[PDB]
Design a protein around this ligand. Structure first.
Ligand SMILES: Clc1ccc(CC2(COc3cccnc3)CCNCC2)cc1Cl
Ligand SMILES: Clc1ccc(CC2(COc3cccnc3)CCNCC2)cc1Cl
Ligand SMILES: Clc1ccc(CC2(COc3cccnc3)CCNCC2)cc1Cl
Ligand SMILES: Clc1ccc(CC2(COc3cccnc3)CCNCC2)cc1Cl
Ligand SMILES: Clc1ccc(CC2(COc3cccnc3)CCNCC2)cc1Cl
Lengths: 198, 198, 203, 200, 200
């Protein structure tokens, strides 16, 4: 039953150890589902956004045989390793709006999708036109380079009561290298093309 | 006595384990008792509301024979499993204003009713009219589908006489939604708050 | 000594267990001592207030013989049961400004008086007049009914001129704190509260 | 070594028990070093202030022989008893800006100096003149009376005061006081800090 | 492997004890990488900044033989000693925007770089001109003097700055300071960071 699965998880899950298999990197899939655009300032180039951050990855230290057992459980994220994702152009702390629970499938596949309110620095010019503005958000591991964590991409849920509407969303994979460091860090660049409603 | 009951509750309650019995779902009742409407913005469609979030459910692992005992106790919710409920259109963290204590009956019936201040995105249009505005708030489990958690409904009586607004009607209807991504159904209660400026 | 008294207190105190004796309720005395009034909004009927919440009750499981010991000690409230008081018309979380320490007397009497800043919904009308405004705040247990917790004022009436800031834009004309026992539709039980009427006006 | 000292302190320190020696009081020294005056409101009589709260006292239960060991260490305040000091006229929670670490000397002398931003209710009248306003802040133990805690002052303190503030400090006086209340038979000691300051 | 390295760190790390090698000081390198200027107030002399706080130091108790193992790991900072650095003219709590993880190399070298949003008191005069304003930020250990913590610059500091800010960076200079105070017999080291920036 579920208590057993959680107990075993508590026994074997190592929340501070990245679950790399055969010394290849962990493949993290990240996809943003925009829910609201709350505040926009064309002068400062700052936006206040609400989004579901769909995150999936594999951790075999959580897996169990589900032949006559449940095949999925909800588990506190503190009992699990979670990717240390950060939005590189963020200017507020992510405000998590939802219960911090992840879904674990018996094969060790993990899905964690918090609802997040966060403020970003990005290009707001054109928000009042019909081409719209395009705000770019880059999300990637803060401390794990491309050999430890890879980041891959995978408007339906957007609020009808926003002052804004979404024209398009593109999610592309990027990789940034730095002076200080020899390795490249992956991110997904999320282009939010949106404009103020007419 | 009460130390005994709390002590056994500490022995038996598994706060991270959903108390499903025989693989039926936990049946959760949710009812919002509105106390105040504090800030209203028709331009941005945002409201600041205070409500008592009446939440009831059963956890039989908490039960005790109450023949020569109290049949009810107050218990910190951190000692209990609580449903992972979220308001889908919330745009602030719920700010809990009250002591986070639930009431537990000897048969394992749990009552948790925090007073909550929260900000929502919803249709504020018509608030200064005689029809009023109708703000809809949907509350449901964030990670548990209908085979694990069911949500059912069970309001001017508690509403502040000092609000600038008055309540015209409250309707609570249950929904059950299936998704693109996912094979299972998720239940919610939709609370339609019809209110206007005095 | 003090280290011993706190040791015994930790041996026997249970913060999640109301210290009811002989199936009777715990008698809680509550008194709000207002120190400042920060914001008042007559349009929205809201106030921002700072007050000392004098809270006393008895817990006989903490008692000790003080013939050759101190007769009073300070204890983290995380080591004690404290009443789950809430103001029914609060519109913000209580913000505690002071060290969260309770005073425990050798006979088991507990005094906890946090300094608190909080916002309330209440009648602000007349505050710019000379009759003043009268804002009523009700404080009672959130989850314990009258057979488990009773709530009383310590003293009912004062002008509070011993505690209220002289540098406020407001002055206090009167504070009367009276006991109530108010009921709800849903429930067969009565809940006790103290209703605190703050009569104050803008200077 | 330093780990040994931290261990010994954890063994002898009772962070929840006041370190009175044979029922005489703990002598706490308190001194405010003003760093900035951030917001000032003459209509509401409120000021937003940043200050270093120098707090020193003795806990002989922490002492050790430092003949060939360090004579001082830094320790999380959670490992120590600290005085339950509070400002009687504060209207906000003190916002601690610095790491919450105390310095402990091998003779058991403790220094804790948080940098604090806090908002107060006090006399702001005259702030736009050349005599300036004089704001009084009272800091004392919240729950310990004078036989348990005594409070004494330890300057212009403009030595640390910010030059980029809109305000300047004309004088700071720190006087010791001890005030009694109606209900109760005992007095509580405090340091009253007088900030004479004006708009530049 | 990595579980073994973390287990080993957890076994050997002493998070509340400063890891001096003999009686030499712990050498912390500090470098601020400015990312944004969010708010600027020329009347009050206050700025709101976002920056990456590059912090490096060595702790050999964390060292391991990485012969056929990984040479680096990510570790929660709660498992490590980290220097009690504080900004001397800050007027808000540092708000950490990023996961609070440090990078540890097999030789005991630690890299911790949080993204931080913080408000400072500093000279904002000239921001609407072409000389620009020069805001100066001082960062150093709050409680460890120079015989326990040394603080030095690394060496850019403005390459990763947002192109979408209302402001631009004209120059960043980082110099080392060393101050002794009236009260205390020791000197405390800091890094001074000069941010020359203007409104576009
Ligand atoms: Cl000095 C410097 C050091 C590292 C980086 C790389 C990044 C931060 O990597 C770390 C590594 C360990 C601890 N904390 C941050 C890579 C992730 N996205 C922000 C940049 C950039 C700079 Cl500029
Ligand atoms: Cl993309 C996507 C869109 C919608 C949903 C379904 C909902 C979220 O279910 C989960 C499941 C596991 C972890 N967190 C959230 C169903 C509950 N109310 C919010 C939506 C799931 C996904 Cl994965
Ligand atoms: Cl619907 C409803 C309406 C009012 C009340 C009574 C109060 C809440 O009692 C509880 C009991 C258990 C858990 N949390 C609150 C106490 C009287 N003050 C808040 C109202 C209870 C319910 Cl259930
Ligand atoms: Cl009613 C009343 C009025 C004044 C005081 C004295 C003060 C509060 O002392 C305590 C003692 C134990 C626990 N908490 C507070 C002395 C400290 N600064 C606020 C006042 C105590 C009471 Cl009980
Ligand atoms: Cl009054 C006074 C004024 C300045 C200093 C030195 C500094 C603070 O040092 C300590 C030492 C032990 C505990 N906490 C702070 C040196 C660090 N940057 C702030 C100043 C110490 C004192 Cl005591």
């Amino acid at each position: 039953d579920r208590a057993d699965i959680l107990y075993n998880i508590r026994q074997t899950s190592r929340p501070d150890v990245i679950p790399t298999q055969r010394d290849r990197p962990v493949a993290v899939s990240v996809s943003l589902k925009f829910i609201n655009i709350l505040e926009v300032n064309e002068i400062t180039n700052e936006v206040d956004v609400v989004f579901w951050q769909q995150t999936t990855w594999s951790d075999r230290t959580l897996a169990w045989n589900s032949s006559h057992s449940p095949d999925q459980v909800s588990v506190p994220i503190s009992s699990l390793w979670v990717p240390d994702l950060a939005a590189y152009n963020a200017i507020s702390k992510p405000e998590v709006l939802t219960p911090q629970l992840a879904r674990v499938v018996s094969d060790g596949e993990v899905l964690y999708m918090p609802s997040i309110r966060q403020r970003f620095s990005c290009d707001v010019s054109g928000v009042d036109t019909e081409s719209g503005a395009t705000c770019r958000i880059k999300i990637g591991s803060w401390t794990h380079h491309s050999r430890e964590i890879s980041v891959d991409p995978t408007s339906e849920y957007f609020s009808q009561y926003s002052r804004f509407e979404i024209l398009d969303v593109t999610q592309k994979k990027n990789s940034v290298t730095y002076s200080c460091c020899p390795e490249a860090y992956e991110d997904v660049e999320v282009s939010l093309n949106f404009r103020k409603k007419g």
